[PDB]
Amino acid sequence: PYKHEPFTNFGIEENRKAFEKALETVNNEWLGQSYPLVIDGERYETENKIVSINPANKEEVVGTVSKATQDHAEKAIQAAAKAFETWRYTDPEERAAVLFRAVAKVRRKKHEFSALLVKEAGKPWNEADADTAEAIDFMEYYARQMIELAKGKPVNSREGERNQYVYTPTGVTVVIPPWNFLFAIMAGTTVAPIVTGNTVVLKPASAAPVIAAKFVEVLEESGLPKGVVNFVPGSGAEVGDYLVDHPKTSIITFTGSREVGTRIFERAAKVQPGQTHLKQVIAEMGGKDTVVVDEDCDIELAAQSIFTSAFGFAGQKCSAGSRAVVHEKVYDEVLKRVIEITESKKVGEPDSADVYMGPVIDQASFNKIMDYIEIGKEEGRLVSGGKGDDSKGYFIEPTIFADLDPKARLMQEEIFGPVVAFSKVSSFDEALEVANNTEYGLTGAVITKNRDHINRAKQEFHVGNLYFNRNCTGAIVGYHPFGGFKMSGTDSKAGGPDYLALHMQAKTISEMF
């Protein structure tokens, strides 16, 4: 019985005023508060801290969170291990219930959760609203999915026996979510194991730990027993490796970079002394996403599709289309039109609805993107943006490079910033060739009036999320399941039908009479 959370229409004055009301509530009350580690229901504070800043205004502290060590991580694993022993026998109805009232708490404070993402992550108003609505969706949808899974799957029974095929919970689950989709993905990859009866150690992205802290609190208020959820933000150097390596860790659910995910996949397979199981890794490892524009297309749609793909949340999306692969017949026109839409938009602090683009997340991220913009001048032609300054916030203009070789670094490597790369092709055959030439297979868009080309792409464009005559940054839970092939990870389709069963192990029960 599921339909998605409607986005806030920011054209109505009645909606615009409520968000304005909510942002000053966050500005004055929610901000600058202090958040401890949470292990087995107990609050741990350290003298050493992670300081969360407003990326649009680098000297406004959003909050200061305690930083965990290898000892705190050790205690978190045991907390979750011990808590698993009872939580795994909890009625699926009473696990889905924790999610249902956690939804209700988030829906009540919808605009102020959104306003915190604005503050902590530098998210524009529509983007921050979409993240919260998507967080709501995950919880609603995974609650309902567990109810359905508790019915089991039918198998054949011979005359004189009763055969049952059911799902059981697995073990301790290390959750490592990213900074970019700070709410939704972290809400989804946290609630999915918990509703399926597993116990969680949550290592939120240190680039944004206040939302996760606020979310952990929401789950404690929702009926979670001590140790089911554990909050341990810290260094991937000390804490991260330790959680992955631990003998009692059963599953790691990871969303982030390819280089980190590769390390995790490799490390988790190594059966440690005292380990009595094989570790499962669920990994979404970003992408390098492609908008194919055919010879015969709606040009306006092609341009609007490239634009939103490239510059939704300053290009800092796993799904972000940093690649424009465009037919020679329409090349110069589509490029002309993309430049017009791009530089008509306003980049600044998201203190109003009309700001389409905010800043990047931090200094390290600012540097990397700025290091990549230099590479684009050596490899292509700068036709828009390329300017950035980190003096008030980490602000970089939406950047467009043209005339790229299909094998250029800018056409191959994840940038996670407001950058597109244009490449001209001379047929649809060559367009799929270049579209398929990266190490990734997350998302892809095709813009075409040609029916044969749609049908061909359905078989031949090798991405997990394939789109026709629209942008490649859709991903709505229950409508478009999300996950990719190749180096985009293990293709675990978040917000689809198969995802909860990935956290569970099947049990066959048979009684001979």
Characterise this structure:
- It contains 14 helices and 25 strands.
- The protein has 513 residues and is α/β, with parallel strands linked by helices.
- The protein folds into two domains: 1-285 and 477-513, Aldehyde Dehydrogenase, Chain A, domain 1, CATH 3.40.605; 286-476, Aldehyde Dehydrogenase, Chain A, domain 2.
- Strand 8 (199-202), helix 7 (210-220) and strand 9 (229-231) form a beta-alpha-beta unit.
- Helix 10 packs across helix 11 (331-342).
Secondary-structure blueprint of this entry?
Blueprint: H1 13-30, E1 33-35, E2 37-39, E3 42-44, E4 49-54, E5 57-66, H2 70-87, H3 93-108, H4 110-121, H5 125-149, E6 161-169, E7 172-176, H6 184-195, E8 199-202, H7 210-220, E9 229-231, H8 236-245, E10 249-255, H9 258-269, E11 280-284, E12 290-293, H10 299-311, E13 323-327, H11 331-342, E14 346-347, E15 355-357, H12 363-379, E16 381-384, E17 388-389, E18 395-396, E19 399-402, E20 419-425, H13 428-435, E21 440-441, E22 443-447, H14 451-460, E23 465-468, E24 485-486, E25 504-512
Parallel strand pairs: 1-5, 7-8, 7-10, 8-9, 10-11, 12-13, 12-22, 13-20, 14-15, 19-20, 22-23
Antiparallel strand pairs: 2-3, 4-5, 6-25, 16-19, 17-18, 21-24
